[PDB]
Amino acid sequence: ITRLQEKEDLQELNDRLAVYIDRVRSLETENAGLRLRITE
Amino acid sequence: RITRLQEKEDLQELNDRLAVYIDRVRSLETENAGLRLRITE
Numbered sequence: 307i308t309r310l311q312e313k314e315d316l317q318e319l320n321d322r323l324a325v326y327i328d329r330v331r332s333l334e335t336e337n338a339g340l341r342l343r344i345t346e
Numbered sequence: 347r348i349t350r351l352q353e354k355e356d357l358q359e360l361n362d363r364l365a366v367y368i369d370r371v372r373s374l375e376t377e378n379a380g381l382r383l384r385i386t387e
Binding site for chain 2: 307315316322323326329330333334337340341343344
């Protein structure tokens with residue numbers, strides 16, 4: 307593939323990693339709050 | 347400096363880790379939904 311395509315494919319992967327890593331962290335925070343609510 | 351084949355391998359590795367995070371997001375969404383339902387009902 308072209309260098310533009312290499313860069314574009316990688317830019318998209320980096321964007322997706324950032325988005326999904328952030329979302330895993332926030333969903334883990336929600337999961338901790340829900341488990342705490344069950345214990346309370 | 348880096349060949350297109352090495353770039354491809356690099357993207358494969360990054361995508362392999364991305365797949366884990368996507369899987370984790372789906373699992374947490376499902377788990378959280380069950381926990382919320384237990385709390386409310």
